Design a protein around this ligand. Structure first.
Ligand SMILES: COc1cscc1-c1cn([C@H]2CCC(=O)NC2=O)nn1
Ligand SMILES: [Zn+2]
Lengths: 796, 74, 341
């Protein structure tokens, strides 16, 4: 296949952030990791000043700072998803700003299943050990000694098996580890002491105790308070020696706490952020000063305000807070004591764009056939929105919906986007549902409701919104039947009817069942400023994905894949069925070929035979693994994204003469992408060569990527260039390119094949002139290669 | 000194047949054929008497013998 | 918990290609975890078994698409965890109790006994479906002691918004949810209140279902647990009645009588003193089965009952047998005459 992958729009969803003295002993820095890009900003009164943006050959899963004795600035500890651990230092000489790896190494155990609660990384208050919980029933201790250049780790055993949370505790003679763990008897909090000399565990200060049935997070209260705070969903507790205090304020009951930080150095004040956005402020009762020892006396929880959903929170200096949201725009907010405008102390200050999580993406030529603009359904929950991206640096503009969008399609003869959306209502005492917010699905100029069990439960109400393409005001909104779920949406004309219809597939789900036993397909017509419904036909299953095909409408009704003709009566009619042994989540039609896929990597390549009227299989591939999105590149190749953030290309052997080879897909190329690709779409952002075709893809973390096709000679030249660059470019963390891009699953690995890492090749233009001479010494292709790289750069 | 009989009552057991033939004299051994694949009796039995005298007694006094409500031919 | 001791009878890689012995007269489609006993009389089998007990106590059993014709493509290995060689009566007899352990695909079968050159198919454990998008902050909710399963979706799959599909779609690909649905469907036919690990659970349930050999071969093909469990869900919905293969018109039993009289499940494998291995399924009551012969405790598999010949009414095929104690009466049916409908 010999394909080419580049990063059009870099990731923006914040996967964690830290505050500390990293650039200099006097500058307070915020470090944000999106997926692989570590961005280093200096905290300034007016806001943030972006100082550095460094890529990493790995997904940053653990980020921390530590200041070992005898140093000047805090070093950054990064762990990659593939378990590359590195320690990095910030050094700038004149105008040069470089990152130096003090130590690097892979710390994955040969045998072990990764923990279901994910990677937990922690550092001692006194910087004498670095603890990780990567594999269950184990604790990986890395002695942070000046002589441990290679990060030589050693394991310690853990009697327990379901450590929920784990963190160190301040003010201990020897390093302590306090952790909340699960057991068939309940949840308990225990302290262990790490004897490095003996490389073992020892009895902890305060023994096991019962805690709430939903304890989730441990917070290490620093000295002189000491001890630990356990924050469950119902009660906040504090344990320290012989002092045990607790509360269960009524405020937190609605939503759990899924983040926190320390606002003061002495730990007398703490922040908390729920799933729904509320920003609570836990205050300790320091007043208990009796004889130089301070002890708790209260745990008031006060509500500050409603901020964007917080996947992380940091308190910058002088009453400014960075709310890093992974599923919505990130915020810089202010905790003004004397503003109290509406009872909330939070006043928005600045908004940073978080394009993802993309759930659907449409390329449309809004202007007069010029560029291909992107319309993407970004965000989820309250912070959902439509995003328009133009290439004329990219320019991103927002259309908030105040609800979750699902899919996007574009109609030209109506100049309208169709967007499926969901909002969450609460069951009322009247037996009905009340909306929590004034969502866009309710604030339409014109509205319709389709015509055809406890208290406090959350019920999802689904709508289709017709949104104008000039002002982005909701021209219409249509609500579906109760307990219905819209799954697929297509804007496509059928048969001989001149007008362009909307089609939506719906499955009715009830909480007591697993596989929807009933669904429907609705054909809407948008004209006269109203959303008339023109046809409806019920299928006995769920409709997952839909596309038009040669003037006919396909559908995935359960495992069945079905063809619909659009008669003169504006009625769907069934032409020819096909029964599969997999459920056809993904459909992609090109010419006469259909590509059908499910979550388990099952790829089928059906074909259409108009002479007889049935579909006949052509090629098949089963290899158990999780597949997120699957796309058709050319008449033969098929590109998909699968588990562990991987890209695979399946090619069908046309030269094969035997059936055993004609009915199988020979995997050609693999590429560990570092990104959970969610949507594939044809299109390009540059005016309409080494590249043929173009497939954009949108991911969860918020990056757009472009995959194209390179020619044989170009591919070989670019691969030799790739191997020649990987010997001069000193990547941060001493992480080898071959390892990062090596296809990865929890079972097995291969080196990359069939893809060229566009980022590395494009990095050629930025290297210093002397380096280029060494890069390509014996090729007989120095300026010609500049021509190559620039021509490639002119694609995205 | 062994006699073979056929057309036996299916419910018949080896011990019962041995006891019944005991009137014919001492029995060294007795067996009945059963479908190897099911375990059902084949209605064929072979009884080896202690001596030829017992076999002769069985042959003489067992002709048209009604045992287990079924006639036995041997 | 006795029927699994077989008292009626001596303590005892992935993708790699090995050549393994085969025992000739065995025809059962053994699935890992199921226990096969065997009886061997011909001297070659005895010698092979003795050498096997010496070296590694292993042998293959082929998943014959046609056992009589010995035409097969896949099979299951077995480790000999118990054996007994009694040679009395002037003939060497070896009775064995082995457990299916691993599976393989047939490359070739060289005829002498036999040696089958086959490759071990690996078992794929697919990690949590949310582990590919899981938010680090929410991971703390992954641990927890109609309402409860609703909470289970709301908790485990609180990342389906980050992806393109709903939470109720990812419940169909979660090991625990599928396993519990298998449970509820099992208790729908019996009142027996089945390990926790998905692989073993899937093997056991696929073994117990009264299905045909073709579908068992199918279920053995799939190397990922989740897909096997889903196929099991599909199968359970289907089978409703069991007919006599030698009748093809008369139903013999309904799934309503299936009840686990042995810890091995409603169906297991037994060998009579002559050897022919039968796959017996226990049901509370039969229908259209006549009895031949009287009951007898002679070498009865279940400790404390007896057996009598059972055959259908019309074509008199050997369907099985009818076996102060709870329960008083039940029927054990040999699967060779249990055609699923
Ligand atoms: C060779 O055939 C025979 C001659 S004498 C007894 C049998 C026989 C026994 N069984 C089963 C009956 C059920 C049970 O519990 N154990 C068995 O072994 N099938 N056939
Ligand atoms: Zn019959």
């Amino acid at each position: 296949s010999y394909n080419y992958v580049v990063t059009a729009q870099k990731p923006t969803a914040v996967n964690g952030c830290v505050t500390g003295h990293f650039t200099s002993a006097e500058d307070l820095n915020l470090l944000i990791a999106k997926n692989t890009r570590l961005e280093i900003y200096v905290v300034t009164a007016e806001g943030l000043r972006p100082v550095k943006e460094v890529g990493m050959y790995g997904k940053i899963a653990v980020m921390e700072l530590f200041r070992p004795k005898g140093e000047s600035k805090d070093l950054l500890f990064i762990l990659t998803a593939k378990y590359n651990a590195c320690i990095l230092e910030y050094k700038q000489s004149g105008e040069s700003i470089d990152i130096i790896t003090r130590a690097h190494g892979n710390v994955q155990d040969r045998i072990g299943r990764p923990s279901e609660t994910g990677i937990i990384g922690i550092i001692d208050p006194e910087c004498r050990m670095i603890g990780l919980r990567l594999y269950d029933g184990l604790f990986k201790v890395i002695p942070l000694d000046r002589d441990n250049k290679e990060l030589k780790a050693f394991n310690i055993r853990l009697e327990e098996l379901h450590v929920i949370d784990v963190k160190f505790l301040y003010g201990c003679q020897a390093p302590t580890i306090c952790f909340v763990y699960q057991d068939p008897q309940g949840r308990h909090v225990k302290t262990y002491e790490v004897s490095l000399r003996e490389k073992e565990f020892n009895k902890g200060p305060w023994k096991q105790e019962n805690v709430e049935a939903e304890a989730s997070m441990v917070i290490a209260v620093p000295e002189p308070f000491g001890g630990a705070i356990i924050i469950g969903q119902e009660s906040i507790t504090y344990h320290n020696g012989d002092k045990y205090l607790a509360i269960a304020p009524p405020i937190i009951k609605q939503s759990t706490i899924v983040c926190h930080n320390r606002v003061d150095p002495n730990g007398s004040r703490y922040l908390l952020g729920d799933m729904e956005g509320r920003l609570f402020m836990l205050l300790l009762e320091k007043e208990e000063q009796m004889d130089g020892t301070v002890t708790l006396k209260d745990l008031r929880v006060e509500l500050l305000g409603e901020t964007s959903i917080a996947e992380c929170l940091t308190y910058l200096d002088n009453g400014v807070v960075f709310v890093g949201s992974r599923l919505g725009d990130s915020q810089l907010v202010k905790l003004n004591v004397d503003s109290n405008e509406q009872g909330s102390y939070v006043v928005a200050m600045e908004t940073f764009t978080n394009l993802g999580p993309i759930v659907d993406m449409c390329v449309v030529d809004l202007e007069r056939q010029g560029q291909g603009q992107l319309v993407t359904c970004s965000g989820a929950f309250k912070e959902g929105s439509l995003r328009i991206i133009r290439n004329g640096k990219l320019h991103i503009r927002t259309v908030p919906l105040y609800e979750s969008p699902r899919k996007i399609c574009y109609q030209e003869v109506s100049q309208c986007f169709g967007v499926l959306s969901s909002r969450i209502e609460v069951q009322d005492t009247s037996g009905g549902t009340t909306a929590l917010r004034p969502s866009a699905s309710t604030q339409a100029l014109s509205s319709s409701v389709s015509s055809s069990t406890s208290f406090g439960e959350e019920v999802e109400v689904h709508n289709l919104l017709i949104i104008d393409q000039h002002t982005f005001e909701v021209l219409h909104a249509h609500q579906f039947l109760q307990n219905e779920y819209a799954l697929s949406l297509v804007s496509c004309k059928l048969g001989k009817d001149p007008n362009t219809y909307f089609i939506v597939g719906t499955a009715m789900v009830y909480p007591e069942e697993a596989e929807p036993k009933q669904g429907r397909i609705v054909v809407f017509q948008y004209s006269d400023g109203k959303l008339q419904t023109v046809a409806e036909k019920e299928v006995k299953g769920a409709v997952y994905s839909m596309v038009e095909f040669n003037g006919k409408l396909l559908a995935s009704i359960n495992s069945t894949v079905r063809l619909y003709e659009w008669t003169t009566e504006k009625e769907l009619r069934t032409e020819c069925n096909h029964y599969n042994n997999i459920m056809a989540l993904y459909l992609k039609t090109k010419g006469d070929f259909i590509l059908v896929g499910d979550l388990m990597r099952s790829v089928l390549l059906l074909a259409y035979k108009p002479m007889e009227g049935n579909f006949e299989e052509i090629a098949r591939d089963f290899n158990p693994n999780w597949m997120s999105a699957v796309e058709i590149l050319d008449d033969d190749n098929f590109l998909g994204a699968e588990n562990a953030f991987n890209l695979f290309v399946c090619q069908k052997d046309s030269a094969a003469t035997t059936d055993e080879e004609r009915q199988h897909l020979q995997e050609v190329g693999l590429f560990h992408l570092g990104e959970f690709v969610n949507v594939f779409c044809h299109g390009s952002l540059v005016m309409q060569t080494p590249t043929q075709g173009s497939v954009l893809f949108g991911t969860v973390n918020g990056m757009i990527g472009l995959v194209t096709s390179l020619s044989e000679s170009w591919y070989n030249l670019l691969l030799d260039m790739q191997n020649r660059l990987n010997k001069v470019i000193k990547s941060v963390g001493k992480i080898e390119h071959s390892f990062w891009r090596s296809f990865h699953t929890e079972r097995k690995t291969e080196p990359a094949t069939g893809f060229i890492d566009g980022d590395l090749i494009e990095s050629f233009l930025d290297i210093s002139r002397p380096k280029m001479q060494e890069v390509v010494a014996n090729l007989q292709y120095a300026d010609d290669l500049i021509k190559v790289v620039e021509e490639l750069t002119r694609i995205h | 000194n062994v006699l073979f009989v056929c057309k036996l009552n299916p419910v018949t057991t080896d011990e019962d047949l041995e006891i019944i033939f005991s009137r014919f004299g001492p029995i060294r051994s007795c067996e009945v054929i059963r479908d190897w694949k099911t375990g059902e009796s084949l209605c064929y039995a072979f009884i080896e008497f202690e001596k030829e005298e017992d076999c002769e007694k069985a042959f003489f006094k067992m002709d048209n013998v009604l045992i287990d409500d079924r006639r036995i031919h041997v | 918990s006795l029927p699994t001791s077989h008292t009626y009878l001596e303590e005892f890689d992935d993708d790699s290609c090995q050549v393994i012995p085969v025992l000739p007269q065995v025809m059962m489609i053994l699935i890992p975890g199921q226990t096969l006993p065997l009886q061997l009389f011909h001297p070659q089998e005895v010698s092979m078994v003795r050498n096997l007990i010496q070296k590694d106590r292993t042998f293959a059993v082929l998943a014959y698409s046609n056992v009589q014709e010995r035409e097969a493509q896949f099979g299951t290995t077995a480790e000999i965890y118990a054996y007994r060689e009694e040679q009395d009566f002037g003939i060497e007899i070896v009775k064995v109790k082995a457990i299916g352990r691993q599976r393989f695909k047939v490359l070739e079968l060289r005829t002498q006994i036999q040696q089958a050159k086959v490759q071990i198919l690996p078992e794929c454990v697919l990690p949590s479906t949310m582990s590919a998008v899981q938010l680090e902050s929410l991971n703390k909710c992954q641990i927890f002691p109609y309402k409860w399963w609703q909470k289970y979706q709301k908790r485990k799959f609180h990342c389906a918004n980050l992806t393109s599909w709903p939470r109720w779609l990812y419940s169909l690909y979660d090991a625990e949810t599928l396993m519990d649905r298998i449970k509820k469907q099992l208790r729908e036919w019996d009142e027996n209140l089945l390990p926790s690990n998905p692989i073993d659970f899937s093997y056991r349930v696929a073994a117990c279902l009264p299905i045909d050999d073709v579908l068992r071969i199918q279920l053995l093909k799939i190397g990922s647990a989740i897909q096997r469990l889903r196929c099991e869900l599909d199968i359970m919905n289907k089978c409703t009645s069991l007919c006599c293969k030698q009748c093809q018109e008369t139903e013999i039993t309904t799934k309503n009588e299936i009840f686990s009289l042995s810890l091995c499940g409603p169906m297991a494998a037994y060998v009579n003193p002559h050897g022919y291995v039968h796959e017996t399924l226990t049901v509370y009551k039969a229908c259209n089965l006549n009895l031949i012969g009287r009951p007898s405790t002679e070498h009865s598999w279940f400790p404390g009952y007896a057996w009598t010949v059972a055959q259908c009414k019309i074509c008199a095929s050997h369907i099985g047998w009818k076996f102060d104690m709870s329960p008083q009466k039940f029927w054990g049916l040999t699967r060779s005459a249990l055609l699923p409908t």
